[PDB]
Structure formats: C-alpha cells, structure tokens
Enzyme design. Structure first.
Site, PDB file in Angstrom:
ATOM      1  N   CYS A  35     -18.631 -12.920  -9.752  1.00 19.14           N
ATOM      2  CA  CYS A  35     -18.064 -13.259  -8.451  1.00 19.14           C
ATOM      3  C   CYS A  35     -18.986 -14.187  -7.663  1.00 19.14           C
ATOM      4  O   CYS A  35     -18.548 -15.227  -7.161  1.00 19.14           O
ATOM      5  CB  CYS A  35     -17.768 -11.982  -7.655  1.00 19.14           C
ATOM      6  SG  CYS A  35     -16.932 -12.317  -6.060  1.00 19.14           S
ATOM      7  N   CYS A  73     -15.253 -15.507  -7.286  1.00 15.79           N
ATOM      8  CA  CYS A  73     -14.634 -15.461  -5.957  1.00 15.79           C
ATOM      9  C   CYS A  73     -15.333 -16.352  -4.943  1.00 15.79           C
ATOM     10  O   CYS A  73     -14.672 -16.946  -4.083  1.00 15.79           O
ATOM     11  CB  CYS A  73     -14.624 -14.036  -5.385  1.00 15.79           C
ATOM     12  SG  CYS A  73     -14.962 -12.638  -6.488  1.00 15.79           S
ATOM     13  N   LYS A 103     -15.109 -20.304  -5.796  1.00 14.89           N
ATOM     14  CA  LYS A 103     -13.716 -20.736  -5.869  1.00 14.89           C
ATOM     15  C   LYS A 103     -13.072 -20.730  -4.481  1.00 14.89           C
ATOM     16  O   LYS A 103     -12.271 -21.615  -4.165  1.00 14.89           O
ATOM     17  CB  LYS A 103     -12.913 -19.871  -6.858  1.00 14.89           C
ATOM     18  CG  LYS A 103     -12.480 -18.511  -6.308  1.00 14.89           C
ATOM     19  CD  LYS A 103     -11.012 -18.235  -6.624  1.00 14.89           C
ATOM     20  CE  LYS A 103     -10.575 -16.802  -6.244  1.00 14.89           C
ATOM     21  NZ  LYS A 103     -10.766 -16.825  -4.793  1.00 14.89           N
ATOM     22  N   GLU A 149      -5.393 -21.348  -9.218  1.00 10.24           N
ATOM     23  CA  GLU A 149      -6.301 -21.595  -8.101  1.00 10.24           C
ATOM     24  C   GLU A 149      -7.119 -22.862  -8.330  1.00 10.24           C
ATOM     25  O   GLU A 149      -7.286 -23.677  -7.413  1.00 10.24           O
ATOM     26  CB  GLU A 149      -7.215 -20.387  -7.888  1.00 10.24           C
ATOM     27  CG  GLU A 149      -6.480 -19.164  -7.268  1.00 10.24           C
ATOM     28  CD  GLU A 149      -7.344 -17.906  -7.233  1.00 10.24           C
ATOM     29  OE1 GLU A 149      -8.382 -17.874  -7.940  1.00 10.24           O
ATOM     30  OE2 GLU A 149      -6.985 -16.943  -6.511  1.00 10.24           O
ATOM     31  N   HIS A 184       2.063 -11.497  19.058  1.00 10.18           N
ATOM     32  CA  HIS A 184       2.709 -12.811  19.141  1.00 10.18           C
ATOM     33  C   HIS A 184       1.779 -13.827  19.808  1.00 10.18           C
ATOM     34  O   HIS A 184       1.135 -13.505  20.816  1.00 10.18           O
ATOM     35  CB  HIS A 184       4.052 -12.672  19.938  1.00 10.18           C
ATOM     36  CG  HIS A 184       4.852 -13.935  20.072  1.00 10.18           C
ATOM     37  ND1 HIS A 184       5.537 -14.506  19.018  1.00 10.18           N
ATOM     38  CD2 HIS A 184       5.138 -14.695  21.159  1.00 10.18           C
ATOM     39  CE1 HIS A 184       6.173 -15.586  19.442  1.00 10.18           C
ATOM     40  NE2 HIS A 184       5.948 -15.721  20.739  1.00 10.18           N
TER      41      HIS A 184
END
Ligand SMILES: Cc1cc2nc3c(=O)[nH]c(=O)nc-3n(C[C@H](O)[C@H](O)[C@H](O)COP(=O)(O)OP(=O)(O)OC[C@H]3O[C@@H](n4cnc5c(N)ncnc54)[C@H](O)[C@@H]3O)c2cc1C
Ligand SMILES: Cc1cc2nc3c(=O)[nH]c(=O)nc-3n(C[C@H](O)[C@H](O)[C@H](O)COP(=O)(O)OP(=O)(O)OC[C@H]3O[C@@H](n4cnc5c(N)ncnc54)[C@H](O)[C@@H]3O)c2cc1C
Ligand SMILES: COc1ccc(C)cc1NC(=O)Nn1cnnc1
Ligand SMILES: COc1ccc(C)cc1NC(=O)Nn1cnnc1
Ligand SMILES: COc1ccc(C)cc1NC(=O)Nn1cnnc1
Ligand SMILES: COc1ccc(C)cc1NC(=O)Nn1cnnc1
Lengths: 588, 588
Positions: free
Chosen positions: A149, A154, A157, A295, A566
């Site tokens: 990773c 991860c 990337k 990806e 919102h």
C-alpha cells in the site's frame, strides 16, 4: 469459563501485572517497572464484570488471592514485597528477560498488517522482531519499508488519481470566473513522480523511526519458517542464520501475476514498476479489468495519455455489474478505449527502452477476440494487471504443517490461528478475507492484543466498505444487487435508486444524469439495507459513514427518518423513493 | 384509537378511496378515476395490520362494511355501482369538485417548505394554491420563485465557495506536475455571478413548471391571513381580493436584520444583495459572526478580496466553541482580518456607487472596542450579517388567534399545528426548530401526507446534522462538547480526538496538523456518541452518513468494529483512541 481465559492469558503474555486502581501497593509496583523501563500489560480487576472470580483463579498459579500479582512468560514472579526485593538486589532485569526463545514474537513481512501487529505487541512488553525484504521486479524495481500500500499501492495510486482530478478542476475554474486557459496547460510526469516518491520516502523513514522508538528489532532480511518456532533468515550478503520465537505471525502479502505468453515478462511492466517509472509511459495498453487496471488507465488518460484497456470478459468481476458498466461508460466517454472480449497472445520488441534520454521503448501486441478475429497494434508501454498471488513456498516449509487452500492462501480460524498452534496469518494471505489495508491493520492490532494483553475482541470481516478510485469514483458497502437476488429471491428484494448532479457540476456544464446511487433492501426483514452503492465525486468520503449504520442493521426507515445536509451529494440517500419494480425513471 | 384515526382521515382528505389490492371492483373504480383525471389518496386495507378494524369502522360513516368506499371532503360518495352511475350520467366531475372553500389548501410562502408541501398535497387530489411574493431589499434587489436557499442562500453561496476552493486547486496543480503559474491568474467577479444567476434562473423556471404539471395554482402575490379560512391577497397591480381554504400552511421564512445605527440601511448591504451584485465588492467589511458572515468573508478572501470581519463577542454562537475557534484561526492564517470585541457606531458615505462604470462606492466606518478604544477605517462595501427574523405582523392578523413566542415565531405542536386548529406552520418560522432547508422540506412533505393521505409519521427534529462551508469546512451532528458536559457532568463525558492530514495535502505541501475530529461520548450509557465534529475538506460529505448511525444510537464500540475505507479523511473516525483526559497529544 473465566478459568480458561486466565490460563490462556498467563501462558501467552510476556509481562503482565494483575492490579486494582485503588491499591497503593499496585502503584508502588507500577512505578518500579516504569523506572526500570520494563514494558508490560496490566489488568485492572476492579474494572471487570467478574474481577472477583478472576482474583480467586489467580491462586491456582500463585497460591495467593491478593493483588498485585506479576507474571513473566507464564511464571508467577511475586507480590509487592517480592518484586521490590528483586529490584533492590539488582535481580529484576534478568528475571523479566529470561525466555526459552530469542523473541516473544517474530513477524515475517513488514507491510500494513505486519507493522501494525509488531508495534502493538511491543507496547505490552513483548520482545518483537519484524522482518521485511522486497524481492525486485523483473526489470529490477525495489523500494523501502512499509509494504504494498505505502510503496506501490493505495498511496501512490491515489496521489496520481488526484493529479488526474486536477485537470478537471483546471477546466471547471474557467467557468467559475478564473482567467486561465486549460487548452495551453500540459502535465510533467517526472515532476509528479518526484513529489510522489518524496512522500513515500518520508513514510519509509517514519516506519523505521516508529520501530526504533518502540524497541522493535527491524531486520531487512528474507525470512522462512522451517519449524514451528524457528525462522531462517538471509541478509543482503546471503549470510544465513536462525532465530527463534514463541509466537509467529505470517504477513507476507502478494505480488502481481504475468500471463504465460511470449514477451510478457521481458517487455511488459506491472503496477509494481509504474509508480516510480522514470519516463512517461506514452501510448499505453492495459491488459486486465480489475480495480487496479481501471484506476491506472483512468489517471493515465487524465494526464494526457493515449490509453487502451483489453478486457477478457467483464469489468470489475465480483462487484455489482450495473455499477461496473457505469464506471466503464464514463471512462470511455472521457477518452479511454476498450477492446472487449479480447486476450493477448504475444508481445514483440520493436525498440529497447532509451534509458539515457528517458524514453519508453516500442512494442507490438498481437492477440485475438473471443469469436476468432485478430488484434494487432503497437504501444510504447504494456501494463499487466491480471491479478495477484502469494508465494508461500518461498516463505513456509511444507514440513512445518501449515495448511494452505487451493489458491495457496493460509487456512485460519476466526482468531487468525493456523493449523500450527503458535503460528498465525494476517492480511492478504489469510484465505477468504477481504484484501484491504485497513482490514490487515485491524487484524494485526487486535491479534497482538489477544496474544499479549488478555484481550478477547475478534476482527469482524463482514460488510467491509470499498471504494474504486476511477475518474468517477465508485463506493460500495454490502451486497451487490445480483448477489442479494440470488440469496433471497427477486420477490423479496426492493431497490431504491436515483440519478443526481453535483452542485459543483452545474456552473461547470458537466453531465446531468451520470452520477447514480441505489439501496438494495430485503422486504421480509423490515426493508433492511443489504447493500449501498454510489457513483460520484468523493465516493469514499460519502460511503464511509454509512458503513457504521449498515454494521448496526440500518433499514430504509432509518435512512428516511434521518435529515439531509444541504447542499451535498450524500444527502440524496436520505430521500430515495423511486423503486426499480415501479418502472419510474431515476433521472432528474 | 383506530376510530379516531379514521374520523380524522375522512374529515380532511380531499378525495380518498378505501380499497383492497385483490379486489376487481376496486380496480374498476380506480380505472374510472384515472380516466377522468381525478387524483386521490388510496388506502389498501389488506396491507395494514388492523385493516379489519378499519373496515368495520367505515360503517359508522357509510352504513356499509365492504370495499370500495369513496369519500369527498368528508362525505361518503358511494360503492362501485354508485360511482359508475355518477360517471356515465356525467355527474362525477361535479361531485368531486364540491367544496365549501375555494381551495383544500392555501400555502403562504413559496420557499423550501411551502413548495414541498404544496406539490405533495396536490398528488392526493387536494386543490392547492401557493402564494409567493419577494419584498425588495432597501436598494431594490428582488428575485424569483423558490425562497431564500435557492435565490440568496445555500445554492449561490456554495457555488461561490466552490469558486474560492478552485483557487487552492490551481495552486495544488503545480505541485502535482501541471505547467500553470498560479501567480499570473486572476478572477472575474461578474463572469462568476453570471453563471450563478443563470443556474438560479433555471431553478426559478423549474419550480413554475413543476407547479403547472401538478395542477397547483401559483399566485405571485402577497398573502395575509385575516380569519382562520380567509387569505387576503394583493397582486402586482395592487388589486386586493380574498380567497378561502380549508387548511392553511404558513411558510413565509425570514429576512436579514440591520443594526440601528446611522447609514446602515442607506449605505450597507446584506447577503440578499451580495449574490447578484453587478460589481466586485472590493475592500469589504463584514459585520457579524454567524455562519452567514464567516462563509461570505471566506469566499470573498479566496477570490482576491481584502476582507475584515468585526466580531461583537464570539464566533458561531451556539456551535461547539473549540471547533468555532479553529475555523477562525484557519481563515486568519489565510488572509481574513478580524476586529475582535468590536461593534459599529455609524457608516458615512464618501462616494456614491458608480452604476455607470460598474464600481462600488466608498464608506467610512466608525466603531469601538469593549474597552472603549475607537475603530475608524474606510471600505468600499459593508455587509451586515447580524441575524435574521420573521415579520409575521405583515402575514398574520392578531385577531386570528395564532400564538407567537418572544422572538415572533409560531408556537406549534409536534405535528406543526398552531393554536388555530386548521392552521399549520413549517420551516424557519416554526419556533424552536433547526432553521435548515432539508428540515423545512421534510416537515412540509410529511404534513401534506398526514392532512390528505391519512399518514401518521411525524418529522423528527433531533440530532440534525449541519455543515458550515467556510474555506476549511466544519461538519457536526449532535451535542457540542460544552453542552454535553453541562447536561451530564464532566466525569460522565469522554472525548476521543485526533488531528489528520488529507493525502491530497502531502504533495501540495499544505498544513500538517490543522484538520481535526472528535467524538463526544457518555460513559454511563455504554459510551454512546452524543456528538460528532470534523474540520476538513468535504466535511458535509463526511458527516452525512454518520447521522444515520447517530439516529440509531451509535456507540464508540460501533465505530471501532466498523472498518475504514483507505485512503480517505473519513476513515480516521473508525480508529480514534486518544482521550482528552489522558493528556496525550492529538497530533499525528
Ligand atoms: C495497485 C494497488 C492499489 C491498492 N489500493 C488499495 C486501496 O486504495 N485501498 C486498500 O484498502 N487496499 C488497496 N490495495 C490493497 C493493499 O495494498 C493490500 O491489501 C495490503 O497492502 C495488504 O497488506 P499485507 O500486510 O497483507 O501485505 P503487504 O502490504 O504486501 O506487505 C507484505 C510485505 O512482506 C514482504 N515479504 C514478502 N515475503 C517476505 C519474506 N519471505 N520475508 C520478509 N518479508 C517478506 C513483502 O515484500 C511486503 O513488504 C491496493 C493494492 C494494489 C496492488
Ligand atoms: C445566506 C444563507 C445561506 C444558507 N445556507 C444554508 C445551507 O447551506 N444549508 C441549509 O440547510 N440552509 C441554509 N440556509 C437556510 C435556508 O435558506 C432556510 O432554512 C430555508 O430557506 C427556510 O425555508 P422556508 O421555507 O422556511 O422559507 P424561505 O425559503 O425563506 O421561503 C419563504 C418565502 O415566502 C415569501 N413570503 C414572505 N412573506 C410572504 C407573504 N406575506 N406572502 C407571500 N409570500 C411571502 C418569501 O419572500 C420567500 O420567498 C441559508 C440561509 C441563508 C440566509
Ligand atoms: C465490458 O463492459 C464494458 C466495457 C467497456 C465499457 C466502456 C463499458 C462496458 N459496459 C457496458 O456494456 N455498457 N453498457 C452499454 N449498454 N449497456 C451497458
Ligand atoms: C410590482 O412588484 C410587485 C410584484 C408582486 C406583488 C404582490 C407586489 C408588487 N409590488 C411592488 O411594487 N413591490 N415593491 C415594494 N417596494 N418596491 C416595490
Ligand atoms: C473570536 O475568536 C476568534 C476570532 C477570530 C479568530 C481568527 C480566531 C478566534 N479564535 C481564537 O480565539 N483562537 N484561539 C487562539 N488561542 N486560543 C484560541
Ligand atoms: C488557501 O488560502 C488562500 C490562498 C490565497 C488567497 C488569496 C486566499 C486564501 N485563503 C483561503 O483559504 N480563503 N480564505 C477565506 N478566509 N480565510 C481564508
């Protein structure tokens, strides 16, 4: 009951003190251990439901029922008076360091799970060693401490994903009133790679500092388990030696596969090589259709590359297929080309990589389609992403007795124990578990606490949320729609869904009905949310919080009674109402 | 019980059919109603647990116990034979339009709540009118249908926030390898305003189309309730007239306040004016410290403006003050100036607004600090953000009998009923409720279903999540830390917290320990999460999902057993462990 928990805790803890928060004799012992810099676990009996039961079971080891009681590696050491006797006669250090083994714990593998496990064990006084070695790729790429990773997964990337996302930000900024011209801006691959690698290097160094400051021994050496307690190590001079440990944790991970065709190993690369590549890949072919494949193709296209993906069958096998098709549709509309129902046959070299002037080579790819016709085209780079596998024959001698499955992964109980009582496995090599960095970390830390602090909590592997960081991101938690229908039947499944448009996309003139979300629910169980899916910006930030609600058994009514924030994309989950069975359009 | 529900439902439903899904006589009546375009509510007795009780209770009104039974405005119309008779004799249309009043429902106010209420009511056959009038601001600003959020609230301010965020994206782009030069790029205010106003105009138009397509009468006129059933209207030609309605919904919202000092109304503006201003405000003073004040000062500084905020006492009164101060610290570090413990005394005009050359004027602001020293400084624009208030004296005659509280808001029962039995209130004018757009929408839709479709569900106003869209955003759900301590005592409260760094900030060389999150928990209630707080990018996307889990009663254990999504900011909530009581540092 309480009896068997106590036995297990005492036999496994390296240094453990049974105590009460109110007793000053306990504080007197705590202080001495702290001054001598003796790390240890502590159990406060006045804070447990059945502390009075435990207090009486201690007598089976110590012949006393009082507190404090100190144990080292399964042996009762003394009450208050006896401990200070050892301290005053300069006898304590030798008692707390005497062991049948070199280490209380040896971790083979210095990645996500292994580093977490090793650091957590050391906190409770376990003497720990962490072994890590990075076998180079075919073209010789190597990297530092931290695992897949940190170095080739991860972390790099997502940083290149962000570089790609910023091309759309540059375009959007014109519509929001900024005076730049996107058409006259370009990207510099090597500048990006330098910044990425400098961050990875800060993580390599951070892990070495962390291990030092926790008194963990770090050996940059290749380890191999030859008997239940013996680990053979080979250093950078191929000096071979043997160390022993009470508990063993296997955490060695996986590496990319290559397809068995001519030219693949010689002239193609994998994700292992891509993140430190010294030249821009150029016209690129990506072979495979996993999240890794999509990806990488996605950000390469966003950085200005000419990208093709060769798909043998479907996109994102194992994920919800309606969502997978929307992911690919978006990348095709934004310039990725797809060669469907297509596999490769050979790679031929036309130009060798120009390592001087920092330029890719040139390759000829030949392949064929599922009905018979032929594929032939030239690319500068070919990237294989056709899956990952462990190679435990390197790590683990078959005579030790650790059972593997048909794929080569370790068969474990629900507390990560192997078929050899003192050996455990975590992370990607643990058979049947989701192959994800936070899973490996939770398993490693929780296991370390059970071994050395008397903890009981297990790792929960169900309904773990995911996110695929394609140019439009896809977050999910729980079952795909097809898996829910298969498991419960179509008549018992209700699906609520809707398109949406991010407020940020309005002034920027982006697409109206491409982002999309749905909840897959079980009618006969109060409209329980079985699976949540969202395609849209920031999909991982959107999905994470709902994973807690799904863990707790959220129903559709729980989503309805909660109020939206919102303006956000996520709020659309709080007012869903169109069902698939109704036939009403989900567009807005 | 069942009988009191049935009488309430029959009395106020406009057109309602009692039915069973398995009955072809019911299907035959549904078919005739559809062909004649008669909208109506429907209750399927076979889908309710006590449908048998309801069936026998219907006889109290109709002298029959079978289905179908059709009612109009409280009066039994007929079974299958009778409805079809009225149909083929051309009498049905007149029966269903019989009313003592012009309208089944009059909504006063065409905003977030009132539009939601009116469209929902019309779906069940209620003949509905919506009144909307926008009183111009002192300088003359006015706008179209949709209310404060759409025209001068959430929508334009988040669009302008996004324009400010794109400033940092342009900066970050260079570090990730893009060739642009941030320092040579400028922002054009009027180009931004044109794109924002074009989106607002499409919302204005979309609401008018929506009311037309639902057969709702839209009157662009000012309404006044003069008796329980009579609304006086005044149109744009000052023609006065009176309309009657069975049920009344008040939904008129609020408008900005001005301080009572010389020059304020004459020479300053408010948020009502800011979102369509034809010139860039230039050097700006913002007076106040609400989320409106800070959000506006924030995007103005990111768009290149020289901005000062003058604060009477504290920031974000009523929000968690540790988070409020961190919000302010970040704004000040990135350019916003603050004049603390300070209030204005007068505004003096030095230059009139130059409406020809499209330029602001120039003002002299005089004020003082709480210790007595003097404030005096020149600005081109002065924005007051010192609170909002309804003015129901313009909406509501005192003789009608609707009780107000000390702040002039309507006192309502938990089903939105006022002290006048046919009159209801929703949205910002409903005393004691959170003043938010999704709350007004939920309240309005749920109320229309109870009045005209026999629903029973109430709006839940507790633990409603918020987000403040300052340059670094602040999301929250539940109690502030100081409120939790006040209610339960310091010893029953535990706070877990951590700093974090978004991965996107590493290559961009942004700050290491500015983003922050905490969970405020109750020890004696199984460590229940009382409040969640987060300062960081995309804070609204992060917070929303966790609001479902807090609604469900999440504990710290629920957060610990849920696995993270990596790499994300939100995942840091799943692994929190440092407590405030421990005194350990939260930096990473
Ligand atoms: C391209 C890519 C992208 C990814 N993106 C994500 C993402 O966004 N999110 C996510 O959750 N997961 C992601 N993953 C998956 C994640 O990287 C893995 O799940 C995780 O790294 C597994 O951790 P581990 O501890 O099991 O093994 P690893 O992290 O692979 O660590 C094992 C270590 O042991 C070493 N080792 C092997 N054999 C020996 C030996 N004999 N002696 C000593 N050391 C040895 C290895 O060299 C390695 O350093 C990604 C993976 C890839 C390939
Ligand atoms: C600057 C700003 C930013 C905001 N940002 C957010 C945000 O990000 N998120 C959020 O949830 N909330 C936000 N809000 C709050 C939100 O705008 C309100 O909560 C919401 O608009 C209230 O809705 P309402 O239906 O009660 O009233 P409104 O939306 O104000 O509608 C009332 C309408 O009735 C009209 N009216 C008044 N009197 C009469 C009369 N006598 N006859 C006829 N019509 C009349 C008014 O002109 C208006 O059109 C913000 C508010 C402001 C001011
Ligand atoms: C292998 O599947 C794809 C590959 C590449 C791409 C670009 C898309 C898909 N999905 C796909 O088929 N989309 N679609 C079209 N009509 N129904 C669904
Ligand atoms: C013509 O505009 C309206 C529209 C609708 C209605 C119901 C009334 C008006 N009357 C109007 O002129 N408003 N006003 C107040 N101060 N300047 C202007
Ligand atoms: C009114 O409070 C502010 C106003 C403006 C600003 C910029 C900040 C604050 N917050 C504040 O006091 N921060 N801080 C400093 N040391 N402890 C806390
Ligand atoms: C990223 O920081 C900036 C950079 C350049 C400029 C010109 C402004 C900012 N300030 C920023 O974030 N916006 N803002 C608003 N109120 N405090 C801060």
């Amino acid at each position: 009951g309480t009896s068997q928990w106590l036995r297990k805790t005492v036999d496994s803890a390296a240094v453990i003190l049974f105590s009460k928060t109110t007793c000053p004799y306990c504080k007197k012992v705590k202080d001495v251990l702290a001054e001598a810099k003796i790390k240890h676990a502590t159990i406060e009996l006045d804070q447990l439901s059945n502390g009075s039961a435990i207090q009486k079971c201690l007598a089976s080891f110590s012949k006393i029922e009082t507190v404090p009681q100190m144990f080292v590696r399964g042996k009762f050491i003394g009450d208050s008076q006896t401990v200070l006797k050892y301290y005053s006669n300069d006898e304590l250090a030798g008692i707390v360091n005497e062991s049948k083994y070199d280490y209380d714990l040896i971790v083979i593998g210095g990645g996500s799970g292994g580093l977490a496990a090793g650091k957590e064990a050391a906190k409770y006084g376990a003497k720990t060693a962490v072994l890590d070695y990075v076998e180079p790729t075919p073209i010789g790429t190597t990297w530092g401490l931290g695992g897949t990773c940190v170095n080739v997964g991860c972390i790099p990337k997502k940083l290149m994903h962000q570089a790609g996302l910023l091309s759309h930000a540059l375009e959007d900024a014109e519509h929001f009133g900024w005076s730049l011209d996107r058409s006259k801006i370009s990207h510099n691959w090597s500048t990006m790679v330098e910044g990425v690698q400098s961050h990875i290097g800060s993580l390599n160094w951070g892990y070495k500092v962390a291990l030092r400051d926790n008194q963990v021994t770090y050996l940059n050496a290749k380890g191999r388990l030859i008997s239940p307690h013996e680990v053979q190590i080979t250093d950078k001079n191929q000096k071979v030696s043997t160390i022993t440990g009470n508990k063993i944790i296997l955490a060695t991970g996986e590496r990319p596969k290559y397809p068995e065709i001519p030219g693949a190993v010689e002239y193609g690369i994998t994700s292992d090589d891509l993140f430190s590549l010294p030249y821009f890949p150029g016209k690129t072919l990506v072979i495979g259709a996993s999240y890794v494949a999509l990806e990488c193709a996605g950000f390469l296209a966003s950085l200005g590359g000419d990208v093709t993906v060769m798909v043998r069958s479907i996109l994102l096998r194992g994920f919800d297929q309606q969502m997978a098709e929307k992911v690919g549709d978006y990348m095709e509309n934004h310039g990725v080309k797809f060669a469907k129902l297509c596999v490769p046959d050979e790679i031929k070299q036309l130009k060798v990589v120009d390592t001087e002037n920092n330029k890719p080579g040139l390759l000829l790819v030949k392949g064929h389609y599922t009905d018979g016709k032929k594929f032939e085209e030239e690319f500068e780079t070919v990237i294989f992403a056709v899956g990952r596998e462990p190679q435990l024959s390197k790590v683990l001698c078959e005579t030790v007795g650790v059972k593997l499955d048909k794929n080569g992964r370790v068969v474990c109980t629900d507390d990560e124990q192997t078929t050899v009582s003192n050996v455990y496995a975590i992370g990607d090599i643990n058979a049947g578990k989701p192959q994800l960095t936070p899973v490996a970390i939770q398993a490693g830390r929780y296991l370390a606490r059970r071994l050395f602090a008397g903890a009981t909590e297990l790792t929960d592997y169900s309904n773990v949320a995911t996110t695929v960081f394609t140019p439009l991101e896809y977050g999910a938690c729980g079952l795909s729609e097809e898996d829910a229908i298969e498991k419960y039947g179509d008549k018992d499944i209700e699906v609520y869904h809707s398109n949406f448009k991010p407020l940020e996309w309005t002034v920027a003139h982006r697409e109206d009905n491409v982002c999309y979300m749905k909840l897959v629910c079980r009618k006969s169980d109060n409209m329980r949310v079985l699976g949540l899916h969202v395609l849209g910006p920031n999909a991982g930030e959107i999905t994470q919080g709902y994973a807690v609600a799904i863990k707790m058994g959220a129903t559709k009514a729980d989503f309805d009674r909660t109020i939206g924030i919102h303006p956000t994309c996520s709020e659309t989950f709080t007012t869903l109402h169109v069902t698939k069975k109704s036939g009403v359009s989900p567009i807005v």
